[PDB]
Amino acid sequence: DMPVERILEAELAVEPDPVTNICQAADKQLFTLVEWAKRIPHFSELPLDDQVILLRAGWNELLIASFSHRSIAVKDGILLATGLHVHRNSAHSAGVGAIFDRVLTELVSKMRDMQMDKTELGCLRAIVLFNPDSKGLSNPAEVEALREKVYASLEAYCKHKYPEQPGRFAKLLLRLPALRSIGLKCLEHLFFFKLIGDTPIDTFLMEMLEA
Amino acid sequence: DMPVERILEAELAVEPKTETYVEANDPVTNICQAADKQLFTLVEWAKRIPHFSELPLDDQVILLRAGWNELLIASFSHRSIAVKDGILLATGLHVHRNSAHSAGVGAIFDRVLTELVSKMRDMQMDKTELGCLRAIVLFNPDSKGLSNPAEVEALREKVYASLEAYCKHKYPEQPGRFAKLLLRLPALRSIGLKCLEHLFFFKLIGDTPIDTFLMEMLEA
Amino acid sequence: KHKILHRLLQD
Amino acid sequence: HKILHRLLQD
Numbered sequence A: 001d002m003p004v005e006r007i008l009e010a011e012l013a014v015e016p017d018p019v020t021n022i023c024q025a026a027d028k029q030l031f032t033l034v035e036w037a038k039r040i041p042h043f044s045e046l047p048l049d050d051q052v053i054l055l056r057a058g059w060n061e062l063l064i065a066s067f068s069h070r071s072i073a074v075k076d077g078i079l080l081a082t083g084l085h086v087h088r089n090s091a092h093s094a095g096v097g098a099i100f101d102r103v104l105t106e107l108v109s110k111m112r113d114m115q116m117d118k119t120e121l122g123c124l125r126a127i128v129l130f131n132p133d134s135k136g137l138s139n140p141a142e143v144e145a146l147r148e149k150v151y152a153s154l155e156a157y158c159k160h161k162y163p164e165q166p167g168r169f170a171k172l173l174l175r176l177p178a179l180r181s182i183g184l185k186c187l188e189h190l191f192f193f194k195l196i197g198d199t200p201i202d203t204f205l206m207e208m209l210e211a
Numbered sequence B: 001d002m003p004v005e006r007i008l009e010a011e012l013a014v015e016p017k018t019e020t021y022v023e024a025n026d027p028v029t030n031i032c033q034a035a036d037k038q039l040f041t042l043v044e045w046a047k048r049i050p051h052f053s054e055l056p057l058d059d060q061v062i063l064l065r066a067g068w069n070e071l072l073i074a075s076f077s078h079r080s081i082a083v084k085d086g087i088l089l090a091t092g093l094h095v096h097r098n099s100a101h102s103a104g105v106g107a108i109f110d111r112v113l114t115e116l117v118s119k120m121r122d123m124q125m126d127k128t129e130l131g132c133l134r135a136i137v138l139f140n141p142d143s144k145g146l147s148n149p150a151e152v153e154a155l156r157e158k159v160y161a162s163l164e165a166y167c168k169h170k171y172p173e174q175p176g177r178f179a180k181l182l183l184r185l186p187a188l189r190s191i192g193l194k195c196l197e198h199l200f201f202f203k204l205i206g207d208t209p210i211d212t213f214l215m216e217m218l219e220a
Numbered sequence C: 001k002h003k004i005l006h007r008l009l010q011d
Numbered sequence D: 001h002k003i004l005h006r007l008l009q010d
């Protein structure tokens, strides 16, 4: 069983140099991300080594999805978990305007246009979490079965909450490629900051960038 | 409208012929020559996808430059379910895991096999579902510079509405099959990006012949 | 730019 | 993976 009501609870029980502030907010969220996964149904029933693999595989996409949806209220900006606004001009003046525009156009604004609610967001994050392709999983089909139940519950919720939008379920799933693409780009930036060393990187975010 | 029959016809019309496999030295050079050959048939394929040609010419250029890598990977991945292992190139050559790893592309080759080929063989993805997935990839409204992104988004929504109807009608006992198809697209996006990185490196070294069309796709 | 792709699409 | 192991064990 994978009820969307408990997936929504995981979201809300967790909802609170510009590059420097962004990285500090990322480290803050890695701590609350772990508490979010434990609240996802059946995640803690997975083997501990599998929970480590899934969180190391998805943390970047998971956090990008959160601050993007959180920023539906902001215009030409992104609301960080620390309460700080990063406007579009501040990000461009910092040399990250390109990836910043991608988040704004492919995620935030796409989330705002369709009015993606917090239940749908939580299910997409759960789908990202239960990634059966993550290398090293002891039981991939166990994680795949969890993913299928999440999007089964999501499609049921979409036919229930928005019965006049027959294509809304697929529209949600088809934001995941762009999320995967933006996640890989954000990772490249983070490694580049760690290689050059001119950007402070806290402990947990540093641990996610190691082997 | 967006009939799946027309999309399926576009797949078979550009499908490689048994002739070519029966008729058939450097692995990477061969793979790159197969990619150049397939880019030409990719243009003919796109013209047979409903409404694609009705888009502005600049949007057709942008959709094909943004999607060609994923579109070609999807083709040779689904094509390779007909054999027990490896990748069948459109030139007829058969790339096995030994040759791929020795040539320096073993990890990306494995990702194709595990995340795309084996999943396509497991769920027995048919060519109609593959064509619809490629058309969804083709109608990418996030492509930068599109003069009319809303129409591209409308066309993508028409494709997967037809895809869901086809899946529920042909495979009524598998209610999640439609979502399972769509959820291979993140892996395709990731494997596409990783494949380009190898291609740009081989181009940089300059010891790999890269024919005209593939060379044009690689230069912005 | 995009010499070949524009030609093939023009047909 | 010191931090991630500790936070998962609770």
Ligand SMILES: CCN(c1ccc(C(C)C)c(OCC(C)C)c1)c1ccc(C(=O)O)cn1
Binding pocket: A019, A022, A023, A025, A026, A029, A059, A060, A061, A063, A064, A066, A067, A078, A079, A080, A081, A082, A096, A099, A100, A103, A186, A189, A190
């Ligand atoms: C995925 C981890 N990450 C995060 C970490 C580093 C970067 C650098 C590329 C700047 C980032 O680039 C965001 C811009 C592209 C918009 C986002 C964050 C940042 C903030 C929050 C948050 O405030 O909730 C969560 N994750």
Ligand SMILES: CCN(c1ccc(C(C)C)c(OCC(C)C)c1)c1ccc(C(=O)O)cn1
Binding pocket: B028, B031, B032, B034, B035, B038, B068, B069, B070, B072, B073, B075, B076, B087, B088, B089, B090, B091, B100, B105, B108, B109, B112, B195, B198, B199
């Ligand atoms: C996506 C464009 N590409 C293509 C171009 C270059 C490479 C190099 C990394 C070797 C490639 O590595 C494929 C696997 C070995 C990972 C695939 C091809 C190649 C062949 C065909 C085809 O024969 O259908 C289509 N696209």
